[model samples]
Each structure stands twice: as C-alpha cells, then as structure tokens.
Target: QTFRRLWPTIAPFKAGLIVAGVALILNAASDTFMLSLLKPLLDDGFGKTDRSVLVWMPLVVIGLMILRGITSYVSSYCISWVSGKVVMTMRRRLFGHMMGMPVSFFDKQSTGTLLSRITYDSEQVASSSSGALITVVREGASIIGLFIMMFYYSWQLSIILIVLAPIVSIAIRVVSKRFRNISKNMQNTMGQVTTSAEQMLKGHKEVLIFGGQEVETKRFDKVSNRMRLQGMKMVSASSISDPIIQLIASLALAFVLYAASFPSVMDSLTAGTITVVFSSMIALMRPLKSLTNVNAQFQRGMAACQTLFTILDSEQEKDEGKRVIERATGDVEFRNVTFTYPGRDVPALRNINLKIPAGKTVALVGRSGSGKSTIASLITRFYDIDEGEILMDGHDLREYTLASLRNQVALVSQNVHLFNDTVANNIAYARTEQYSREQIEEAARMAYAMDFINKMDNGLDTVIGENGVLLSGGQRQRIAIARALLRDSPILILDEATSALDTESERAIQAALDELQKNRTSLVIAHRLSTIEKADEIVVVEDGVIVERGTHNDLLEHRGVYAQLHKMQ
Candidate 1:
C-alpha cells in the first residue's frame, strides 16, 4: 500500500530508471562472461598449450573489466540522479500542502515534527528509492546470471542449492517485519528528539535566566536515550539476519561439494568445468549478501513513506465559496455568534453580538482569556463560528472566498513575527513585488519606524536576525505595525498591537494608528483600558459573554465592568 502511494513520486524518473537497469544488466552479463571465460582459459590455453588462446584470453579479461567499470559508473549516476529528484519533489509537495492547511492544523502540530517530515523522512525515502532499490536490481541480476551458469555446469549439484533457498527466505521474512516496526518507532523518536532540542534552542535565554538547565538537560536526555535505544534495536536485527543467511548458504555449499565428489559426477565433470562451477558459486555470495542487507533499508524507507503519506492525505482548509470581491466596505457584524475550539468543552465566545459601522472604531476590553482576542480571530475567519453568522457588508463571511475575505483585512497581533531578512524586505514581505521602495519607506515612516531604521548602519537594508532578534521589543512591534500599515486593507484588527511599546512610543504610534483608522472599520483588543478611552464604542466581555457596551463616558457613568477595568488599569 505504501509503495503504491509512492509510485507517483518515482514514476517521473522512469526513463532514468530504465537506463540504470540496462547498465546493471550489462555489468552483470560481463561478470558472468568473465567467469565462463575462466573455464576456456584454463582448458585451451594451459592444457592445450596454444599460444593464440593465451594471448586472446588476457585481452578478453581486460575488455570485460573495462566494460564493467563503465557500466557501474553509468548505473550509479543515473540511480542517484533519480533519487535526488524524488526527494526534491516530495519536499516541494509536502511544504505546499502544509501551507494550504488551516490554522487548526498548525495548532495541533509542532514545528519540529513538520521539519522532520521534510528533512529526515524524505532522506529515508530516498535511501529506499535509490540505494536499496539499486542493490535489489543490480545484485538480483548478478545472482540470476551466476545461477544460470551454475545450473548449466551441473544441474544435479544446483538442485541441492535450491533446496536451501526456503530456509533463507523464511529468515528474511521474519527479520524484515521486525525491522519495519522498529523503523517506524525510530522515526517517531527522532521527531521527539528534534522537538526537544528545538524548544531548548528557541528558549535558551529563558533556560539560562530561570536556572532551568538541569530540568531541560534531563528532559532532552530522556528523548535522546529513546532514540538511541531504537537505533540499537535496528542494528541488532540487521546484524543477526546477515549471519543467519550466511549460515544457510554455507550449508548449501557443503552439500554441493559433497555431491561433486560422487563417482558419477566426477566422471562427467572435467577439472576446468569444476573450476568454473566453484568460482560461480562463490561469486554469488557477495550479491546475495547485498540483497539481504538491502531488506532492512527497504523496510525503513517504507515506514518513512507511510508517515509522509499521512500528512499529504490530510484535509486542507475548506475554501469552497465561489464569491470574489475586489474589496469589502469595512462594515462587520457578529450576530448571536458562538464558537468552541476543537477538543475544548468550554466555548471561546458565546452569544457575541457586535457591530462596527463603516469608518468606526470598536474596542473590546476584557481580562486575559475573556475572549477579546477570539473576536479578532473570528473577524479574520481563522475558525468558523459554531452558531449564528459573521457578516461583512451584509454578506455572510463564509460566502466570500477565503483569499478575498482575508485580502480585505489587515492584522497586527501582540506576538509580532518578523523573518530573518533585511528590514526593508521584512516590511515589504509578500507584497514586495506590489509595493516599491518609496511605498515601504512611507509605511515605515507612518508607523514611526524610520527613526531607528535610519540609525542602523545599513539603513533600510540592515538584516534582522530571526524574529528581528537584533532589534528591541518596541522596535519589533513598530516593524509589525509598519507591515500592517503597508497592507492598507479596508478592515483592520489590532489584538494588543501596542502592548510592547513604551509610553512615549505608544503615544506616537497611537497617533499614527488613529490617522490610519480613518474611513476604515477597526476592531481593537486591548488589555489597557486607557488606550481605548476615545474609541467610538467599547464592549466589555467576561467569561465569553458581553457584560457592557457603550462609549467611554457612558460605560464610566454606568460604573460596570468597563469602568472597573479602567480603574484597575
């Protein structure tokens, strides 16, 4: 079943595979012909004492050696080229599929596991496609050629060898199943090791400042030890299977020698014929051993392929809507909306009724886990609501295509993500082709990011480390704001966007944000009540339900949840 699924990945390289197979056959034929020549060289050149026979025998041997070398090189090159293509194709498809998955898929999976699928699992699949497969084809051909020569020399002795084949077959069958199970476990353990190490590397500062070295070290060691244990088990299985196969072959060799010593057999077989048969039998052992060893590699590749196929087969985000719009009018309404995250018993938002007219700014103020951020997520259609409807410009949110719906919204969250690239590139991001250098600079200026950007030695071209690690927290937030500002969508969402800024920076950015929000509908989620005091309308939520809704003065006069939150801030 796994191979059936993986065939498409290999199918495109069929021409290369055919070339490799032809080279393997030529190489195997050369080896068989060389062995056959040994009999004639010994009989005619030595016994008959013919000068021409000796002269031609050496030339034939050299010609076969040269042919073997050329064919071996062609086969190796072709096989490797095909294997590399397979890996590249698998990685491209895996990453493209992952990009299409919904946000919920990322929430349930770890970055390390996905990384392992792309890097480690694809390499394993390549080993099966190239190394193990080449060995099976090349060595299997060599074995077949040798056996044909052996049977022609004496079918009576060859029959004895065939009798021992079933024992070796049984041994391989038992060992391969065990190898596959261990390989699956080993792949999973490797993912865990990657995850543990990735976490430590990403949070190294926290580990150092909080004195978490002892705990983290122990945790990493536990996963690493499991990975080592699975590897040892695989090694043991491979080591044991080889000797058992060799022992079976040895027993068959003994039987063949005994039969060759029989009076009738000795009378029929000449000295030269005996030499050819014995040499061919001995030469078969190397390719036979290679075939046995390849079994383990083949099993490992199959296990990894199964894991990758699971991810490829997974469901992507549902985007069936046919409607497409150039832009939305920025009016949004949530009517009796309720939503519960997958696997959670409690609702994230319940009976949430809200409206933001075109060009109006609505603020959602609440404590942590009070569903403020959930509102912003819903507006972007990150997750669909379980009940009721979210409408934009009087159309159901689900009615618009996901791309068109998201195109109308711009978002800046508390955790700003900046790529490891130049400051200008990060601000421009995916829209680099759309926005020019002047536009990027203008957006940066509006977000108050140009002040520090100009201070850097490279100005706008300075490369920021991962997540803008070279910059301060406020600087990173400003870059994120600059990104959203550059997007310039009709609808804006700010989920604690200014939380990281200091008082003075916040004041300056707030002025810029206020100007940007003009003639655009905006939903602001803020923990600090003072930031939203001048908001056109404010809604206070508690335990997933709205407790109050009014302007700053109206809420203050009511002395309800909004006023209490303002006093606490």
Candidate 2:
C-alpha cells in the first residue's frame, strides 16, 4: 500500500531503476551459471582427464565472478542513488507542507514529533524501499534460476523443495504481522523520546534553578526503557524467525540426501547429476533466508510511511480570499465577536464589541487572561474569531488575503520572540521592502536599544545567541519593539511591549512610542494601567466579556475595572 502511495516519488528515477533492474537480473544469472559448472567440474575435471575442462572452465569461473562483481556494483549503486534522492524529496515535501499549516494545527503538534518524521522516519521508508526492492528482484531471481537448474539436473531430487516451501511461507506470514505491530509501537515511542530530550534542553533554566536533574533523569529513563523494550521485541522476532526459516530451507536438501540413501532413489541419477542437484539446492538456501528476512525492514518502513502520510494529508491554512490591499487605513472594529481556542470549552472572548478609529490608540486594560492579547491577535488574523464580524478598513478581516492583512499589522507581544541573528538583522528582519542600515538603526534608537547595542564589541553586527540568549529579557523586548517600529504597518499591537523594562527604561522609550502611534491605529494591552493613561479610550474585559469602556478620566470617575487596575498599579 505504501509502495502504491510512493509512486510519484519513484517515477522520476525511471532511467536509473531500469539500469538497476537489468544489472540485478545479470547478477542472478551469474549465480545460476556458477552452479551449472559444478556438474562438469565433478564429472569432467575429477573423473575424466578432459583438457578443455581444466583449461577453459577455471577461466570462465573467474570471468563470471568478475562479471558478478561489476553487476553487483551497478545494481547496488543505482538503488542507493534512488533511495537518497527519494529521501531528500520526501523530506522537502513534508517540510513545505508543515510550513503552510495553520496556527491551531501547530498548537496540537510537538516539534519533536514533526521533526522525527521529517528526518528519521522519512529515511527509514526510503532505505526500506531500497532493501526490499533489492531482495525481491536480485534474490528472487536467483531462487527461480537455481530451481530451474535443479529441475534440469534431476526432477526426482528437486521435487523435495516443492513440499517444504509452504512451511517456510507460513512462518514468514506470522513473523511479518508481528514485525508490523512492533514497528508501529517503536515509531510512537521514538517520537516521545525525541520530545523528552528536546524539552529538557528548552527548559534547562527552570530545571537548574529548581534542581530538577533527578526528576528529568527519571523522566528520560521511563521513555528510554520503553524504547529498549521495543528494541528487544524486534530483536527477538528477528532472532527467532530468521534461523527457523533457514532451517526449513535447509530441510529441502536434507530430505533429498535422506531419500538418496535408498537404492531406488539412487538409481534415478548418476554421480554428476546428483552432485549438481545437491549443490543447486545448497545455493538456494541463502536467497530463501534473505527473502524472508526483508519482512522486518519492510514493516518498519511502511509504519514510518503511515505516520508521515497522516501529517502530509492533514489540512493546511486556508488562503481563499482573492482580495489584496496595497495599504490599509487602520480603522479596526470587533462587533459581537466571540472565539474559543481549539480544545477549550470556555470562550476566550464572548460577544465583545470595540472600535479604534484610524490613527487612534485604544487601550484594553484587565487582569491576566482577560482576552486582551486575544483581541490584539485578531487584528493580525493569527486565528479567526469563532463568531461575529471583525472589520478592518471597512471590510471583514477574512475578506483580505492573509498575507496582505498581516502585512498591514506590526505586533510586539509579551513573549518577545527573537531569532539568533545580528542586532541589525533582527530589527529589519525579512520585510517585503529592503531596509537601508540607516532605517534599521533609526528604529533601534526609537526602541531605546542603541545603548546596549553600542556597548557590544561589534555593535549592530554582534550575534545574539539562540533566541537572543546573550541579551537580557529587557533587551529582547526592545529589539521586538524596534522590529514593530521598523515595520511601520498601519495597525500596531503592543501587548505588554514594555513590561520587562524598569521605570526609567519605560520612561525613556514612551515618547518614541507616542510618536510611533501618530499615524496608526494602535492596540495597547497592558497589565500596568499607567502606560495606557494617555490612550484615547480604555476598555476593560473580564472572563471573555467586555465589562467597562470610557476615556481614562471617565473610567476613573466611574471607579470600575479600569480605575481599580489603575489604583493597584
């Protein structure tokens, strides 16, 4: 079934496959001819003094072996080429598919699970395809050729093999089923192992401060034990089945020799014929064992394919909107909008209505988990609202293409994500328009990041370690702010954009932020109410529902949600 699904991946390498197929046939042909010479070697060389047998036969034997070596190289090399190319192409396809997936899709998936399939599991399927094809073509052809020679030499002795084939096949059938189930279990367990290791490094800080080394070690040991147990099951399956299948194959010749012990069976063949037939049967044993041994590798590849196919076939982000906008007016409104994150019963925001006119700032003030960040994320269209309409620039948010809609919004969230890049590159990062060095530096200065940047050895060119691990939290937030500042999009979202900064640092950048908000519709979601005192309007949310709304003074006069948070701060 997986082979059928793998058609497109294989189709491109037809020319190489043909070369491999022809060489494989010749490889098997060389084996059969080697067995054919055994009869003459026994009768003509040993018994008779035939000069032609001594002179020509040894030369033919050496030449045939050289031919076998050449064919073996050609066949093995071609199949390897196909497997490597197929693995690379499949990994690229899986990565491309994963990139276009929706935000909600990522929320449910682990990085390790996806990473394992794209790399380890994909290669498993490819290598399996290579080995299985080699066995099916090369060994299978050898078995058939050897059987034909055995029949030609003496049908009476060769008939014993026919009786024993069913026994070998039945064992293969049971062993293959066991291998398939074991392979499925191992892939799932391996993914957990990768995720376990990935999380330990990502959470190294928390683990260190809290002294969780023992806890993490035991957690890893649990999964590693399961991994070892699965490996033992595979080992036992292979160990038990391989020799048993070979034993059955060997019994074919065993019965032939036993039957020859009787005078009646011995009368059916001369010394030459009996020698060739026994040697042919001996040649057939390894190919039979090799054929059955592939079942384990075959099942492992198919199981890996099943895991990858589930991801490749899953739905991606929808890009159905045909509309594109050059520049948005930054008038944003949410009317009776309600949304629940996937897998959560409670809505994050319920029947919420709000408006921010063009070039105005609206502050959403509330306690933690009050849908403040959710409202900001909607403007970027990171996730769609479950119900009601979100209008942007007089059109429904979904009406515009996702790229075009996102291009109009510049967001700086509380988490403050930064790549492992130079300070200048992180600020100017991958926008549609190229930024001159001057423009990037300008944005950094506005975010008040120039002081720390200048202190670094290379200044703007200094590498910030992975996720800016070299920089403090406050510095990382400033870099994120500078990114939004450089974006200069019509709509801006600042979700705790200055939360990491102390009072002086916050005061230093507040003026630049006020100037930055001059020509954009801004969302200021803050826990500290002081940052939003100058906002044109203040809206408060509690438990996914809007609870209060007014100007700063008006809300303070009402002594409601906004005023209470303001007093606390």
Candidate 3:
C-alpha cells in the first residue's frame, strides 16, 4: 500500500537513492566488521602483542572507523535531501489542489481540518517516511549481512538464534494489529479536535454575544478528551509490545551463549568470530523491533494520506474549456430556470423565464425568500441552475468559463467583506495587476470614495481591518461599489448594495450608481420599492415565481402584489 502510488515521486531521485542505499550497506558492514577486530585487537595488540604487528593492526582499525563515519554521513545527507524534496513538492500540489476545489467542497469541510491535514498530516509523513526509510535501508541490510557472517562463523549457534525468530515474529504481528488500529483512530480524532477548536475561534463573537461560552468550552473539552483517550490507547499497546519483545530477545541470547560453552562449538569458533556472532545478534534485534514499531507510524501516515487525498481528489469548479469573455453586451436571459441547493429538496428559484435587453435597468422586488437574491445568484453563476439555462449575450453561461462569466458582471451585495489590507489594495482587488494608480483613483472617484480616502490618515493606503470591521457599514458598501466600478463589467448586480446607508450616503451611492448604470445592463434586487422606482422595468417575484412584471409606475397602476409591496414600504 505504501509503495503503490509512491514510485512516481521517487523515480526522479533513483540515482540519489541508490547511492544512499550503497552507503548505508557499507556503513553497517563496517560496524559488523569492527566486532571481529575487537578480539584480535585485545589478543594480539594488548595481551601478547608483537610491536610491529600492533602498528599495522591499529592503522587498519582506524581506517575502518573512518570508512564507517564517511558512509553514514553520506547516507544521511542524501536521504534527507530526497525526503525533504518529496514533502515540499507534495505540499505545493495540495495547496494548488485546494484552490481548484469548488466552493461547495469548502462549505462542507472545516478550515481547521484542512489546515491540520496540510501541516500536521505532512509532518507525520516527514517523521515516519524519513525515519522509516533510512532505518529500513540501513538496518535491514545490516541484519541480513550480519546473519550471513554469523552463519559462516558457526552455523550451529546461528540456527539456535534463528529458531526463536518465528516466536518474535508472532509477537510483533499481534501487537502491530492493535497499534495500527489505534494509530489510525488517533489521527482522525486529532483532526476533529483541531476542526472544532478552529470553528469556535472563528465564531467567538457569536459565542460571546449569545452567552454560549460555557457550551463552547464544554464542546471543545469533549473533543480534546476523545483525542487524549485515543493517544492513551496507542501508548498502552506500545507498552505491551515492548516488554514481550525484550523477554523473547533475552531468551534467544541465553540459548546462543549456553550453546557457545560446548566443546564442539567452542573449539570450532575463533574468538574473533564469536565476538562478531554476538554483535550480529544484538544488531539484528534493534532493527527487527524498529521495523515492527514503524508499522504503527505508517498507519498514521496512511490515515493522513486518505484525508489529504479527499481534498486533492474533490471535484474542482469546472473552468476547463472556458474562454475569456471580454466586453459582454449584457443581453441577460433566464429560460425556464430552476435551482435547488445541494441536499435541499425545495427549490430556491422555480421554473421562471426573464429577459433583460442590453443597456437596461431591471429591478427584482419581492418579500424575503421570494427568489430575488436567487435570481441575482443565477446571473452571477454562484450556483448552477438545476434545470433550464442562463444566457449572457445569447450564449449559455456554462459555455463560458467561470472567470470569463464573472468578468462580465460586477456584483455588490449588502454583506461586503474586505481583507486586512490597504483600502487601495481592496479597491484594486478586482483588477489589481491590470489597473494602474491613476485608473484606481478614477474608479474610487466615481464611487464618491475620494472624500473618505482624503479623510483617512494613510489616504487610499490606509489598512482596512479584517472584514472591514474598522469601517462603518456605509464605508464598506461604498468601497465595494468602487471595486465593482474598477472591474467595469457591462452587467452590474446591485444586491441591496445601498440598503445599509443613511439618506446622505444612500443618495451619494445612488448617484454614483446612476453614472455606473449608463450603457450597461443593471439588475437590482431591492427591499425598498422606492429604490427601484426609476428602473426601466420592475419584476415582482413571490414564492419562487414571478407574480407580475412591468415598469414601476405601471405596476403601481395595476395595484396587485407590486402595489401592495409599494404601499407596505
């Protein structure tokens, strides 16, 4: 499972990996080789050393030590480079994948979960992959190489140790099952804890406003407790495996030592060979146990991979084959369109047909939940229609790419959101790279934003707090108008954009909008009947259906739903 999709990522680094593997083998061989030299150094150089023999013996040992050190360093450096690059590339791909995912995907998933998947999950891969990769490469090779040397020295003692291997293997298999399960569960629980905490922080204002602090605190605590319990379970499984493996290794060591005391065994083995045999036994145990432990870590890595894949594999917003639609004539048409949000049974907009000719102002007026906003949403392609089609310039909306379609329309809604950046940057956001300083000023001037810009200490460069919290409702709305004006799209959507302002600000914004409306198709979703009084045509919608349609004065004369709405206002 681990190696399945991993080859593509590692293929490019094959030469580097091969070098690293060779270095590890050499490093481990030198360490095993030193065990044999120990007895010779003690017997020949220390106990009954001939002076000339001692000189060459010490030099040979020193050379082996130098070789081991160089190989180990080379192996570590190469693997680190390879592992780091893999993770760096993986993270970049995940980031790009997230950007391409549709808005609906974000609506269902939490930001905290996504953030944890990228940061925490990536760290898991780094820890397990780097550590496990090096260990498997170096340790597995050393274990096999040492076992061969041990059998060559004394096959009888080697067989005794080999018989105990099946017992150790069985113990590892049992413990690994428990460890893998708990490890998988722990990663999932941790994601939940992270997600819950993030949501609480983002909605802290609501928590305080509604006096739900205690409720939120308890909710967070419950998630934390769940994670702690899963972690404890993992630790408990490790505790059981460690003692059982240690006991088995000790018994194996005793059998090897007792067998060495026999005359046939003792006489056949050289003192240097016996030293090498014992060292090999000890060296093999550590990696064998570590290989088992790595199973647990790999389980966590697998869990993380599943989550990261979920985001990376989600259906992206369909922007493929879309063309750049520059300068739309704003011939908007909704032909028997109907739309229902995903997982929603009821339709937000029912089967309806409407048309707005080029360079005209059309007003959509209705009670709350009467599909006024839904109409605007269809025009903007925020949500695709479940049935029928929306056409701009006599072309189906889906035919044009999302960018191209949005480029033809400028939307200013009541709920305006701003990033924590300079006011100039926010206003220029629509066409930041394309527009110059002079053009930005002209757009801001048209929105009547120059007065506030001069009042600000940093002028247009003054930073707007996150979501424009520092500015009044009116200020943010005007800034949005400036942003839309800067885009200069031929079709404008005014979604109660002037609803939050006082009379003075409203009049200023309305006047600016009047200039903006010239030579463009304007769709206004208004709560105030007076706001749409001068519209070329008024559309009255009720219960997802268009109840009446006519000019504002003509609708008033008919004295139907339109007249009733006007009278109520």
Candidate 4:
C-alpha cells in the first residue's frame, strides 16, 4: 500500500532522488573520514610532537568539514524539494478522488473524520515519508560508511560487532510489530474522537435545547479517553525500542572493552590503535542507534500508507460512458428505473417511469418513507439506479459528464449549506466569476433575499456566518434559492426547500418559486400536500413504486396514497 501511494508522486522525482543519494553518500563518507582523522591527529601529530605532520592536518580537517557541509546541504535541499512536491500532488489527487466518491461513501463517514484524514493523516504520510527517506538514505549510507572505516581500522573488533546484529534485529522486529498494531488502533480511535467532537459541536443547539449537555459531554469523554489511551500506548511502545537497543549496544561495548584489555590483545595493539577503535565505536553508535530505531519509523509509515491507499483504491464513480452535456433543455425522463441503497434490503425506487416536458413544474408528494426525495436524487444521478435508466433530453444521464450534467440542475434542500462567505458570494456561488453584480442581485430579488441583503450593514458584501448560522432558517433557504437561481439552470429541484419556513416565509418563497418556475422545469418534493396543489403534475410514490399520478384534484378523487397524504396534512 505504501508503495502504491508513493508511486505516482515519487516516480517523477527519481532523478532528483538519485542526485540526492549521491550527495548523501559523499557527505557520509567525508564525515566518517573526518572522524577517523581525529585518531591520527591525536596519536601522531599532537602527542608525538610531530610538527611536520601536524602542519597540514588541521587544513585537511577543515577541507573535509567544508566538503561534508556542502554535500549535506545539497542532499537535504534536493530531497526536501522533491518530497514537498510529491506531497502537494498527493493532496490534490486525494481531494479529487474524494469529490468523485459516491454519496454512500460520505454517509458512512463524518466530515471531521474525513477532514482529519485529508489534513492530519496525509500530513503524517508526507512528513514520515520525507524524514524516513532522508534518514534511510543519509544516515543509512553513513552507517555503512562508518562501518567500513571501523573495519579498516580493526577487523577483529568489526567481527565482534557482527555477533550482536541478529539479537538487535530480532528485538526491533518484535517491537515494530507491536507498535504497528497500536498505531493502527490509535489512528482509528483518533478518527472516532474527531467524528464525535464534530457531531457535538454541530448539534450543540439541540443538545442544549434538550438539556442533554451532560450526556453529550459524557459521550465525548468516552471517545476522548479511548483516543488518549491508544495514543499513549503507541508512544510508550515506540519509546522503548531505542532504549532497549541502546542497552544491547552497551553490553556489546562491555565485551569489546574487556577483550581489548586482555594481555594478548594489548600486546598486539599499541595504545593509539585502541584509542582509534574506541573513537570509531563512539561514531558508530549514533547510526547504529538510528538503524535500530528505524524499525518503528517503518511500521508507522507502512500503516499510514495502507490507509492512504485504501482511499485511493476504493471504487471511484463510473465515468466511462460520459460525454459533455451543455445547455440541457430541462426535459427529464425516468424509464423503468429501479434503485436500492447499498446494504438495504428494500428498494428505494422500483420500476419507476416518469417524464416532464420542458418548462413545466412537477411535484412529487408522499409520506416520509415513500421516496419523494429519492426521485430528485435519481434525477441528479447522486446514486445510480439498479435497473433501467434516467434520461435528460433523450440522452442517458450517465452519458453526460457528472460536472456538466449537474451544471444543468440546481438543488435547494431543507438543509441549505452556505459557506462562511459574503452574501453576494453565497448568492453568486454558482456563477461567481461569470455573472455580473446586476445578474446576482436579480437572482436575490427573485428569491426574496434582497430584503435581508439590504438590511445588513454591508449589504451584499456582509459576511454570512458559517453555514449561514447567523441567519434565520428561512433567510438561509432564500440565500440558497438565490444561489440556484443565479446558476440560471433550466432544471430546478426543490427538495423540501420550504419545509423549515414559517407560513408567511413559505408563502413568500412559494411566490418566488412560482416566478422562477416560469419557462423552467421544476421538480418539487414537498411533505405538505398543499405546497404542490398547484403543480402541473403530482406523482405519489410509495414503497419504491409510483402508485398514483395526476393533478391534485385527480389524485384526491382517486382516494389513493396522495389523497390519504393530503387528508393527513
């Protein structure tokens, strides 16, 4: 999974990586050489009072330092540049993938959890990948370079160091496995915590209104505690890997020290050689420690990589047979269509067939479970039907690109989503760049939003709060309607668009809708039967099937589901 996510981004930077790798190798070798020179300078140049040999030793050391610094800088700069580009590309791709995902994908996830994955989790991958790449290439090559120098100085000691390698390797592997398991759990729980927090914050009004603040707090506490516990476990397990390896190295050092002190060993080596070997051991310790701890880094990175791939690998919405569909005539048709939501035993819509000629207002009226809104969703192709097809002007909805197809339809739902932006921007969102200020204000007036805009201090420029929270529900709905009107799409979908409005607000909105419906095909899904009484056509949907259809009076005369719904309302 790690390899798959890294492939597209990293593949392009292979040349830069090669250059960085060479620089790292040179830098590590030069650093080890400089460290090795300390032995000769101490033993011969200074202690023996060899002025001639000492004359250029300092200069050589300075040259090595300068070379090492240059190489290190080049390697770090190039690798970081490449890795940063990769991260940027990855983020863009992830966002594109997310937008293309089906509604059901979003249904099972929370906005906060999704946001965390895109922001925090992806960032984790970026930093970990870059750091691990640098560490492995730079420090890894340095370890090898330092080992070669150690072997050059004393083969006997190098041979002794090899014995401890397997023991440390096995121990690190065990710890890494444990860390990976805990890390995965921590990631999942962190998402859960984010999801819980987001839900509590978004629903704070309801929680407070019901006086369930303590309940909400307790729920959050449970989620927070789980996240904290798992996170601490990961940290605790990872923290132990390095120290345990350091202890093992300490034991190895003790054996080496004891062996070096043996009479036979001392007789074979001069004090200078022993000093050089000891200095080499000290230099080797850092890379040795890093190499040992790398196991944990790899595990965390691998786990994150798997999650990143899972998103990328998930099925993207099918766009195989799509074509550009511009300037739709607003003539929508449903022919023998059937649909059931994923994981649902019952169908949402079954054997549905309907049509609306251009520039007509059609209303779908039914009870809560009847699929009135499902018809609107199908028209927009939010979820593909299980059988048959929906067409726009004799062309299959799937035949058009999702972008162009959706461009022709405007949806205003009960939950109108408005971003934190100005009133003008919110109204002009659908045609912000293309439409003139005159055009925007015209749509606002048509939606009855101009009054509120004029009331604000800054008029159209006044900032609407997040999701338009500062505005009343009716005002927000008007803003949403203004946005859809500004799009100037031939098709408009009002799915319970007036459900949240008061009687006066609904009446005003209905007047606006009446005006907007002129020369446009409007599909209205209303819970209140009275709202659609004037609709050109009224279809009653029940149990995934359209059981009754006619004008309001025609359906009332039949005494079918529509008639029963009308009576109930």
User: All candidates' TM-scores?
Assistant: 0.89, 0.88, 0.87, 0.83
Q: Model 2's lDDT to the true fold?
A: 0.65
Question: In order, what lDDT does every prediction score?
Answer: 0.66, 0.65, 0.65, 0.64
Q: Which of 2 and 4 is ahead in TM-score?
A: 2
TM-score, candidate 3, is: 0.87
Worst 10 residues of 1 by lDDT: 449-458
Q: Estimate, for each residue in 1-569, the C-alpha lDDT of model 4 and write its tens digit.
A: 45664566545488767877777777666456655566566676464456556765778778876886787677677767777676666567766656545575565665774665554456466546554664656355535543764476556655555554556556556665666677666665566666765776677578788877687777768877777786676667666766766677677556556645653455555666356646656665656555434555555556655566574445556754665555556577777877766666656676766777756777765566565566656777777644776666766777777667777777876566668877557777786685576766665666654445436534556677878777557677667666766666656767676655656656676666667556567667776754678776767666677667777788776865666666767
Please say which candidate is ahead in TM-score: 3 or 4. 3
lDDT of 1 at 179: 61
**Which residue pairs collide in model 4, if any?**
none
In model 4, which range of ten residues has the least summed lDDT?
A: 449-458
Runs off by more than 4 Å, candidate 1: 10-12, 45-51, 164-175, 258-272, 342-344, 391-395, 453-458, 500-516, 527-531, 564-569
What lDDT score is found at residue 187 in candidate 3? 74
Off by over 4 Å in 2: 45-49, 122-126, 133-138, 150-174, 250-266, 287-294, 342-344, 391-395, 430-435, 449-451, 454-458, 502-517, 527-531, 564-569
Which 10 successive residues of model 3 have the least lDDT summed? Answer: 449-458
TM-score: which candidate is best? Answer: 1
Q: Which tens-of-lDDT digit does each residue in 418-521 have in candidate 3?
A: 78867567777887885676776666666664346436534566677777777566676677667776776766777776656656656566656666566576
| Model 1 per-residue lDDT tens digits across residues 505-565 | 6667665677756667666667675457866677667667776777767878685566566
Reference-based lDDT, residue 569, model 4:
72
Question: Tens-digit lDDT track for model 2 on 137-201?
Answer: 64456455546644755565455555545555575666667656776676656666667666655
